[PDB]
RNA sequence: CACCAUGUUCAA
RNA sequence: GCGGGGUGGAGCAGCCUGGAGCUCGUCGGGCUCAUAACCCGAAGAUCGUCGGUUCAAAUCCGGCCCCCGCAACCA
RNA sequence: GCGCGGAUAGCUCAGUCGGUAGAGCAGGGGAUUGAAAAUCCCCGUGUCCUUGGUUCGAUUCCGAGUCCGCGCACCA
RNA sequence: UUCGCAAGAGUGAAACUUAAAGAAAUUGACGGAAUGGCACCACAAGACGUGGAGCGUGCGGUUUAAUUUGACCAACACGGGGAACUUUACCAGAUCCGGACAGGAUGAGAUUGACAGAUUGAGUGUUCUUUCUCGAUUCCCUGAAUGGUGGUGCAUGGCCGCUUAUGGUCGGUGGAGUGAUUUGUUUGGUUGAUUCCGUCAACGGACGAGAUCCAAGCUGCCCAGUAGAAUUCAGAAUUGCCCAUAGGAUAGCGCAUUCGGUCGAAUUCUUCUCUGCGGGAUUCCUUUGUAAUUGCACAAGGUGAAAUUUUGGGCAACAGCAGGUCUGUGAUGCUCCUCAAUGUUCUGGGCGACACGCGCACUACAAUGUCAGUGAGAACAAGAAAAACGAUCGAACCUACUUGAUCAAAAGAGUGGGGAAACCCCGGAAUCACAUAGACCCACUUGGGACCGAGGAUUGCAAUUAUUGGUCGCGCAACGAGGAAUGUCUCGUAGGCGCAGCUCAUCAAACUGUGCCGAUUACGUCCCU
RNA sequence: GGGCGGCAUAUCUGUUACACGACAACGCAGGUGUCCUAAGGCGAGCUCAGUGGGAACAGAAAUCUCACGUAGAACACAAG
RNA sequence: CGGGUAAACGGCGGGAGUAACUAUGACUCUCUUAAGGUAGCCAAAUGCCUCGUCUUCCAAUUAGAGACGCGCAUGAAUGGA
């Protein structure tokens, strides 16, 4: 039939798929941590993001927040 | 490959549309008459079996088939009885094959 | 002592 | 004006109602290293075309279309 | 001068006189080759000659033709 | 131009064209030239087929998105090539980098991975929305590099096939030629044999042949609790008068036979079996044979288990082929693609697609048979698992027994055994046999099973394009012995008949072996090749 | 004109032919020299060519059946 | 009836395909005779078409000559050249 290993040339119908690149939000520690200020002066600091509660996933990691799902990047495990 | 030289595939097409039958037949067969035995005894049938059938120097379930027009099954199946009754006697047996012959006076 | 014609071009 | 002929792809019988034959060609398989020759098989017909007769038409009777002959003299 | 027959793909030649465009060769690309010839497969083709009646429409039916073939044109 | 009746004879150029044309010898190759031998990949005398039918399979064509491709005596059940996915190299699409390393631009936020919705063939983070996780491993771009069943076997290595199954091949020194070259290596007889004897411008050697090696047959030592046998005690069975529904032929004329579950003991032994070294066979023996006029040998018979390479294989020189393989390899040079890849994965399809032609098989066309019973009976062989997973064994692998079974097959289960002379296994193979008093009775028929329908089970992640069994239907599909042609074969052979291994999760019309039943013909020839 | 051709030279039907009979041409369209022992003679039964409905193989067309059917068939050969 | 005899009278074919540009047809097939026209010669005092086609001769060539040959219907003592 054909020629051995010839190149194809064909045509493409669909748009080309880009490469994932990943999106990086600058100062991402600074989001997870909402500070609070003491009458004494000392500022106590509090989480605002939920902590994976399997002792596996993450033992002090942190979980997401959607507006229709909390998950977490280690466990994937979703709540809705 | 032997490729052909000057073959079309319109040649090559019609050859194999007119390939289909035709060329046979290479044997000359020469096709035989029929034969009519009966599978069952008549009464006639049955009379010669038990007068004519003995008296024969030799007695085979195919050669009575082939004097009374009858079938070998039936032709043994009677060949057994006469010897039942020790009007013939029988000289070789076996499962297969069956030879009588008359008895001596 | 029947009949027995032929083999594209260069190069291994 | 007179006489003859169109039949498988080619050439030609049959044309003496009831049918298409011969040689070559084509196709398939053998032989051969291979082709040809040779061997074993097969297929292929509006019998020019349009009508008529006949139970039935290559085959008989008319028209047409071609092809080939013979005549076309005395002024 | 007259009558008849041809002008279809790049060339040649088919085409139910009214729906047909069949091809071969010449080309471009592949198969085969150690490379070629040759062979095979796939792709580009086209009314002719000009007006009409257009069968619903014309190489195909008529008129003109060109442009080529084929015949034939006192009398004594 | 001269001569000739003519035919011609004498004399006799040029233009142009061309790198050789010729001569004699040498070695090959060839001959429808001669001589002597040999081979059933040759014939003769024959056997059994193939070519005709159906079907399996390979090859070509046709078709197709693709129907991947090599090969055309020495290609075509060949590539161990029996492809559901994989394999797989082809087609339609989607991922990954398995682009190391080096140099630059980013960078402790370089990057990696993702639930939910939709993009999609994909409850495929492929991508996208949205964020979390990861962490200096990576991304961006320039060179480079790697991988490839990409090309080229006409660039190669290695291996294989073939020339080429026959008896062939090559130095040294000496002789002969100016030389290629020749002699040795030659003729005569013999032999499968360049095997020997003899002769000799050759003498000494080397390889191939032979020898060696492996299996068969006969036999020695050894040997058994992974092979067996014979006795003696006990325990059980038959036990004599018996004449078949017609009942022939075929051994028996101090103690009558059986009983691998009677899972009984004791004793003895190596007749069968296992096998590491041996023995044995070589023209050994004899012809008032052939030949001998030395010999080398040969033919019949003998001895013998075996009587001429004992039989069957393995190995096999030197010269080659542009033979096959770059689809075996981490064998490889050059070249091609290289991040929407010719790499690599995943999904699906294809390799199987059918007017046809061909090779090789399978099954047949029936009575020297088909069915349904019953009997006796081989040999070679294969059998399970890790640095995984469970508590050093234990599960995969093969089986036997029981059950299912208070009712088809194929199944499905439970128990036990086997690492294999230990279990399978006393290995109940099929040809075969049966005086089976069985059915059929010459017909496309109870021959022949192609083709197709419905149920069910099993293998597998997946059975549609039936994977494979089993059940009932179809059998009105050809086929009644096959034209021209053509293959293989000399004795435990052909032909027939099964069995195992191999491919193998499932699947032999294949191959590689194995044993079983077992002939006809020839003991030649050079007519064909 | 004659020759070549044909036959209009013996003869039948239709038309020319002019509604009695008769009527020419090398006028038109065709025939004749044969054929039949039944294809002659007679008597009796029947109805034809075609259509339509129906009936296995059977279809446009084979044979059976029922209707309609003034001749649209046949009467050896041309025609009336 | 059977032989001989043509320097006796005389006679001496047709269709189709085919060469790597295209013509053409050495070649082949087929039907056929008593034999199928040979050597020669030719639009010849013999060629219808025809005033054939080419060359030459002229300013101009139905004429002349030389060629060609599918030759209505050339041709060998019906003697050919
Ligand atoms: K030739
Ligand atoms: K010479
Ligand atoms: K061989
Ligand atoms: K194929
Ligand atoms: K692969
Ligand atoms: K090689
Ligand atoms: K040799
Ligand atoms: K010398
Ligand atoms: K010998
Ligand atoms: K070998
Ligand atoms: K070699
Ligand atoms: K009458
Ligand atoms: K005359
Ligand atoms: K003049
Ligand atoms: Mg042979
Ligand atoms: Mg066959
Ligand atoms: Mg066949
Ligand atoms: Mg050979
Ligand atoms: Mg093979
Ligand atoms: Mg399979
Ligand atoms: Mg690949
Ligand atoms: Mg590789
Ligand atoms: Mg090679
Ligand atoms: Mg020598
Ligand atoms: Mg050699
Ligand atoms: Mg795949
Ligand atoms: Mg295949
Ligand atoms: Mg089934
Ligand atoms: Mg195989
Ligand atoms: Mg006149
Ligand atoms: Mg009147
Ligand atoms: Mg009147
Ligand atoms: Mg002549
Ligand atoms: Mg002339
Ligand atoms: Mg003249
Ligand atoms: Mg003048
Ligand atoms: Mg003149
Ligand atoms: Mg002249
Ligand atoms: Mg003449
Ligand atoms: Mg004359
Ligand atoms: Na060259
Ligand atoms: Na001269
Ligand atoms: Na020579
Ligand atoms: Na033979
Ligand atoms: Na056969
Ligand atoms: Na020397
Ligand atoms: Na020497
Ligand atoms: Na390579
Ligand atoms: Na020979
Ligand atoms: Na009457």
Not at chain 1, 35 to 47: F, I, L, M, P, Q
Not at chain 1, 54 to 71: E, I, L, N, S
Not at chain 2, 49 to 68: A, G, M, N, Q
Request: aromatic share 6%; net charge positive; charged share 35%.
């Amino acid at each position: 039939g054909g020629k051995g290993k010839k190149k194809k040339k064909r045509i493409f119908t669909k748009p080309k798929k880009p490469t994932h690149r990943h999106k990086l939000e600058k100062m991402r520690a600074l989001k997870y941590f909402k500070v609070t200020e003491n009458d004494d002066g000392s500022y106590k600091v509090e989480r605002t993001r939920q902590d994976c509660p399997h002792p596996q996933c993450g033992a002090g990691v942190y979980m997401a927040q959607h507006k229709d799902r909390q998950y977490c990047g280690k466990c994937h495990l979703t709540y809705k | 490959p032997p490729k052909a030289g000057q073959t079309k595939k319109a040649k090559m097409e019609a050859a194999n549309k007119g390939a289909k039958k035709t060329t046979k037949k290479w044997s000359k067969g020469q096709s035989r008459e029929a034969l009519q035995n009966a599978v069952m005894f008549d009464k006639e049938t049955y009379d010669k079996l038990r007068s004519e059938v003995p008296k024969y120097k030799l007695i085979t379930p195919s050669i009575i088939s082939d004097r009374l027009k009858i079938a070998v099954s039936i032709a043994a199946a009677g060949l057994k009885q006469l010897c039942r009754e020790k009007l013939i006697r029988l000289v070789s047996c076996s499962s297969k094959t069956r030879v009588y012959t008359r008895i001596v006076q």
